[PDB]
Amino acid sequence: VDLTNCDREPIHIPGYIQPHGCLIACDNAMRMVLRHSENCGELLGLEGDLNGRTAEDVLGKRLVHDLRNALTVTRPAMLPAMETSDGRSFDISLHRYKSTTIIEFEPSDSDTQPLGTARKMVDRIREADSVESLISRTTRLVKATLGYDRVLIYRFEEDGAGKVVSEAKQPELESFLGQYFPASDIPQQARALYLKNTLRIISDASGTPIPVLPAVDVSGEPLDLSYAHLRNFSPIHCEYLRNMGVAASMSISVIVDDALWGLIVCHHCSPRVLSMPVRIAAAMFGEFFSMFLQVLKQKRRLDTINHAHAALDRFLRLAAHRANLEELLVDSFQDFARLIPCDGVGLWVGNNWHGHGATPPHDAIPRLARFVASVSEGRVWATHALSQAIPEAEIYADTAAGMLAIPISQVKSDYLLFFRKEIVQNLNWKSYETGPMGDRLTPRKSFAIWKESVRLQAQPWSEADREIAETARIALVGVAFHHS
Amino acid sequence: VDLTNCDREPIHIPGYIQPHGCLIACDNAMRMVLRHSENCGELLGLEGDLNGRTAEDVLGKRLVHDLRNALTVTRPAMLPAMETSDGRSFDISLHRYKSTTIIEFEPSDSDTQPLGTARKMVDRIREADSVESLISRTTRLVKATLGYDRVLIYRFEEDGAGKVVSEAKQPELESFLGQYFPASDIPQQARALYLKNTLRIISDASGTPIPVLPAVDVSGEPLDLSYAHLRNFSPIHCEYLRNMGVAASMSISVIVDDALWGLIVCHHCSPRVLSMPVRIAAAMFGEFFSMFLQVLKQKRRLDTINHAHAALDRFLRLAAHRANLEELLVDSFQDFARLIPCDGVGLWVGNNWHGHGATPPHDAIPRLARFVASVSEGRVWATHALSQAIPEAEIYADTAAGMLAIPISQVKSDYLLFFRKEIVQNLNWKSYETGPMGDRLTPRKSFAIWKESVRLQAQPWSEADREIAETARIALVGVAFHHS
Numbered sequence: 001v002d003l004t005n006c007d008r009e010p011i012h013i014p015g016y017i018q019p020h021g022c023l024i025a026c027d028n029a030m031r032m033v034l035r036h037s038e039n040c041g042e043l044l045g046l047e048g049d050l051n052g053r054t055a056e057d058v059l060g061k062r063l064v065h066d067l068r069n070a071l072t073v074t075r076p077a078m079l080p081a082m083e084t085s086d087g088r089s090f091d092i093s094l095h096r097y098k099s100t101t102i103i104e105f106e107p108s109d110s111d112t113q114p115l116g117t118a119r120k121m122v123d124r125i126r127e128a129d130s131v132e133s134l135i136s137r138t139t140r141l142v143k144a145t146l147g148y149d150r151v152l153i154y155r156f157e158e159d160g161a162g163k164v165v166s167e168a169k170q171p172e173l174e175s176f177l178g179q180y181f182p183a184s185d186i187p188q189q190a191r192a193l194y195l196k197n198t199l200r201i202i203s204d205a206s207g208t209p210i211p212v213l214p215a216v217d218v219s220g221e222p223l224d225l226s227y228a229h230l231r232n233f234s235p236i237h238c239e240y241l242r243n244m245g246v247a248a249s250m251s252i253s254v255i256v257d258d259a260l261w262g263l264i265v266c267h268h269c270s271p272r273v274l275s276m277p278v279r280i281a282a283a284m285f286g287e288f289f290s291m292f293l294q295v296l297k298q299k300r301r302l303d304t305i306n307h308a309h310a311a312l313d314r315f316l317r318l319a320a321h322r323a324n325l326e327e328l329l330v331d332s333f334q335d336f337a338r339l340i341p342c343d344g345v346g347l348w349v350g351n352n353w354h355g356h357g358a359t360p361p362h363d364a365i366p367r368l369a370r371f372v373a374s375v376s377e378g379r380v381w382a383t384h385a386l387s388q389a390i391p392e393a394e395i396y397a398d399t400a401a402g403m404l405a406i407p408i409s410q411v412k413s414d415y416l417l418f419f420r421k422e423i424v425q426n427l428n429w430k431s432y433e434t435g436p437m438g439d440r441l442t443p444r445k446s447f448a449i450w451k452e453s454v455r456l457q458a459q460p461w462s463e464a465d466r467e468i469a470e471t472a473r474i475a476l477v478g479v480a481f482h483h484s
Numbered sequence: 485v486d487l488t489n490c491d492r493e494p495i496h497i498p499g500y501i502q503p504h505g506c507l508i509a510c511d512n513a514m515r516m517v518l519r520h521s522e523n524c525g526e527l528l529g530l531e532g533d534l535n536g537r538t539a540e541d542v543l544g545k546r547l548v549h550d551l552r553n554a555l556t557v558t559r560p561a562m563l564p565a566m567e568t569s570d571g572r573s574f575d576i577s578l579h580r581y582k583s584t585t586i587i588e589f590e591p592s593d594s595d596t597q598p599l600g601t602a603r604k605m606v607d608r609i610r611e612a613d614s615v616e617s618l619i620s621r622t623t624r625l626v627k628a629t630l631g632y633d634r635v636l637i638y639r640f641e642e643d644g645a646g647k648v649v650s651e652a653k654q655p656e657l658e659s660f661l662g663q664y665f666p667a668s669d670i671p672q673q674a675r676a677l678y679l680k681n682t683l684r685i686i687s688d689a690s691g692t693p694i695p696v697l698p699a700v701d702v703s704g705e706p707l708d709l710s711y712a713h714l715r716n717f718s719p720i721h722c723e724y725l726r727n728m729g730v731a732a733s734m735s736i737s738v739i740v741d742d743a744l745w746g747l748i749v750c751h752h753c754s755p756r757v758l759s760m761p762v763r764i765a766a767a768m769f770g771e772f773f774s775m776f777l778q779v780l781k782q783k784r785r786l787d788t789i790n791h792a793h794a795a796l797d798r799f800l801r802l803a804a805h806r807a808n809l810e811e812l813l814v815d816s817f818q819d820f821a822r823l824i825p826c827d828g829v830g831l832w833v834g835n836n837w838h839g840h841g842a843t844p845p846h847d848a849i850p851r852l853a854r855f856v857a858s859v860s861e862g863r864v865w866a867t868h869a870l871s872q873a874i875p876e877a878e879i880y881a882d883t884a885a886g887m888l889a890i891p892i893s894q895v896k897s898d899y900l901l902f903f904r905k906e907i908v909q910n911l912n913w914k915s916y917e918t919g920p921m922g923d924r925l926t927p928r929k930s931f932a933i934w935k936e937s938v939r940l941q942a943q944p945w946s947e948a949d950r951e952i953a954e955t956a957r958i959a960l961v962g963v964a965f966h967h968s
């Protein structure tokens with residue numbers, strides 16, 4: 001495994017598990033054992049090879065009656081504090097995928113209440129009245145409740161890149177708040193797993209991984225550990241964590257509108273297992289956090305569009321009380337900066353330019369106005385990478401790297417131009433020992449690679465930005481026709 | 485051409501034009517004439533064959549200088565009252581498609597002002613404050629201004645079917661208001677044309693079509709008349725109009741969010757040509773009608789979701805002041821009918837049923853509740869065709885043909901159920917002589933075929949309906965967790 005085509009590694013079939021539990025694979029109808037982990041013996045107390053031997057034999061008829069009963073009810077069923085034929089107590093994660101029954105065993109924890117812990121946490125977030133307020137309080141809350149050394153919220157940008165939008169940490173540790181990371185740092189097959197396995201744990205990044213027997217069966221097939229919580233993680237990621245001085249992790253998938261919005265990511269500096277009941281509670285908390293964020297995002301989109309409609313209605317009331325519409329636009333145009341987040345706004349009317357805020361230089365505008373007129377086709381036009389459309393625009397990218405243009409006339413070539421500075425201008429942001437695979441696996445190199453990937457580019461225009469621009473196009477084109 | 489697989493007929497390459505003008509096809513760079521209409525001679529005054537002869541020869545160097553000048557500026561350029569070498573006056577529709585220049589000639593009309601007519605009309609719709617108010621006033625306005633005998637607005641449903649949502653007509657004519665028509669009555673290749681050619685005219689449905697020479701050239705290629713306003717229409721449609729007693733038509737394409745929302749359709753009982761300047765004005769009017777409807781649709785979606793959020797906030801304030809949540813739901817559930825348009829609503833809580841309005845019978849509910857629990861997977865579930873999911877549900881389809889189910893608990897199998905009657909129950913709706921191809925081509929048979937196609941089906945659940953159900957799911961599941 002080498003660090004070039006990152007999306008290639010099959011992380012779902014590594015043929016190893018983590019040492020904090022043992023795994024037993026059986027046939028579809030759980031009749032007999034097909035595969036098992038090397039540490040099955042040491043933990044369950046059993047001796048010799050377990051493969052071929054029937055299910056009723058290995059675990060006892062008492063236990064299998066309950067396991068087979070539960071499989072009749074792809075989501076893993078979680079049965080805590082089960083009695084084995086020996087008399088030992090285990091927590092059991094049971095699931096079925098690709099017609100293979102998988103049974104995960106871990107030492108029991110009986111002195112926790114899942115729904116109790118979950119409710120207490122969900123109660124403290126349910127009253128949050130903004131995305132910012134939910135995000136900020138969640139990092140603190142999760143840290144105080146699950147006692148991890150650092151808790152991040154990692155939000156995915158449009159281009160797959162990740163931003164650290166919230167942080168709770170021990171004072172001694174370094175901050176990642178406001179730092180970005182490349183799309184490659186979390187490959188595509190990883191995001192696929194995270195969309196179907198909502199909670200993930202690494203107990204010990206420096207632990208010895210326990211191999212599954214057999215790795216490949218008669219048919220040449222590997223064991224798919226997609227929904228298995230004991231699945232061992234890519235050595236690339238584990239080397240990354242080791243270099244960061246992180247011994248353990250727990251991540252929660254944030255699903256909004258059926259898409260992976262981001263991760264709640266917990267780091268610990270010493271090894272750390274969460275017991276099944278604590279994991280159940282944290283997963284409940286994750287589902288509610290996702291649901292509340294979704295509603296809060298919907299409410300913010302509504303408020304943004306409502307505000308734009310009120311703004312435009314105010315302007316249309318003025319426009320009907322003023323003879324010269326061109327005069328009004330020259331006086332008013334900067335006010336349109338309240339509709340769409342921009343670093344500068346400009347009016348191009350009757351081959352005259354009027355600027356406000358961060359705009360390209362006066363001499364550069366006519367080239368830009370001519371270009372827009374050619375590709376616009378009387379529709380809204382927007383790029384976050386201006387230099388890719390006009391190479392000479394590279395020189396003023398620090399001032400204006402992104403442009404959204406609104407036609408304000410049905411007939412004449414007049415435009416309302418919104419600009420954004422290049423994304424590195426708007427940034428509001430230590431030494432790391434490396435492993436065998438080099439200094440690529442450090443937050444320092446990741447952030448430097450991202451910085452390069454976004455050179456001469458602005459924050460992209462959202463759907464909400466484009467929807468408002470379009471409503472503003474119909475408003476200005478409409479009132480322009482009235483006057484003529 | 486026979487009436488089975490309707491989407492098959494190539495209406496874009498019929499090799500004929502309408503008699504109210506003449507057509508001349510030239511090469512990409514308009515050097516010489518490749519094709520021409522049989523009536524080119526009679527109208528332009530020219531004698532013999534025009535194919536092969538150079539452009540400069542046929543029209544004169546004076547005219548071609550202006551035509552070639554205009555082609556340098558896929559949208560057809562419209563040049564009214566042009567002087568031919570003879571001295572006659574013609575209105576010229578010039579366009580270029582598939583590297584073939586097409587020139588359309590019609591006798592001139594100089595005693596109209598396009599922008600004047602357009603502004604007067606656009607001024608009367610620009611202040612409309614609801615979709616209903618824009619739709620209703622537009623049919624009357626277009627009838628009074630363009631003097632057509634009947635003006636319809638034909639709105640496309642989700643399944644391609646069309647509904648007559650507005651009508652202005654002569655008293656003597658019969659009404660189509662509230663009638664539906666099958667998706668097949670306007671085939672797919674037709675809707676494709678209408679998305680790129682926004683205005684269409686039939687001068688005379690009983691007129692003799694003029695053939696293009698040659699129909700097929702050396703390469704075996706036909707002349708594509710997609711953007712040509714003289715293109716002759718399918719004889720299926722023309723037979724339809726003849727059976728309706730309609731001699732002429734003019735349709736305007738209504739584009740909303742870059743999709744064909746429907747048509748403004750004008751019928752005349754006598755033959756009728758609209759002059760180029762009148763067509764320009766009507767096309768301007770069509771663009772503004774589309775733009776205003778789009779904004780009004782956006783504003784109505786906003787108001788609907790805002791109202792749902794206020795409703796849910798009111799309910800959450802009550803829920804925090806009441807110990808028994810199940811009591812509150814039993815008292816309150818009918819009020820949820822204000823969120824989503826429904827004919828009935830029901831509560832399934834603790835294996836007890838409470839109904840309100842048009843719901844399935846008491847004895848039928850547990851079967852339905854068991855079914856929903858199996859397919860729901862804790863997500864919102866909705867069908868407009870209940871009998872297709874549960875065959876025995878056919879018997880009560882007149883009362884409840886459609887169902888949307890909201891889970892109200894994270895743990896228990898409790899549901900808020902919304903129902904809709906079958907669409908023919910909610911309907912609020914003469915003899916026709918037929919032609920060679922039978923009685924299929926009559927509004928009577930079309931409406932009867934549609935009625936059959938929607939048997940045992942309700943009005944489908946919109947995106948707005950599903951978005952509100954989802955927000956209500958998160959609200960009820962969220963407050964349910966709080967109580968436990």
Ligand SMILES: *C/C=C1/C(=C/C2=NC(=C\c3[nH]c(/C=C4\NC(=O)C(C=C)=C4C)c(C)c3CCC(=O)O)/C(CCC(=O)O)=C2C)NC(=O)C1C
Nearest residue numbers: 003006011181185186187190200233234236237249251443
């Ligand atoms: C070429 C391959 C690379 C790569 C692959 C990779 N990353 C994976 C997981 C993963 N990566 C991150 C990244 C960070 N977490 C942090 O806290 C920081 C801090 C600066 C970074 C940059 C995260 C959060 C995750 C997910 C962790 C989790 O879910 O617990 C994986 C998948 C691991 C698996 O087996 O499931 C792969 C593969 N990462 C690289 O940087 C590179 C070059």
Ligand SMILES: *C/C=C1/C(=C/C2=NC(=C\c3[nH]c(/C=C4\NC(=O)C(C=C)=C4C)c(C)c3CCC(=O)O)/C(CCC(=O)O)=C2C)NC(=O)C1C
Nearest residue numbers: 487490495665669670671674684717718720721733735927
């Ligand atoms: C199997 C083929 C059929 C068919 C084909 C067809 N229809 C076309 C156009 C068209 N059809 C309608 C329908 C109506 N208009 C009305 O006013 C009423 C009133 C009750 C009906 C049912 C309309 C509006 C149009 C468009 C008219 C226009 O744009 O002016 C076409 C395309 C015609 C063309 O060459 O562009 C085709 C093909 N219609 C059938 O009913 C059937 C069975």
Ligand SMILES: [Cl-]
Nearest residue numbers: 334335337338
């Ligand atoms: Cl301000």
Ligand SMILES: [Cl-]
Nearest residue numbers: 818819821822
């Ligand atoms: Cl009411």
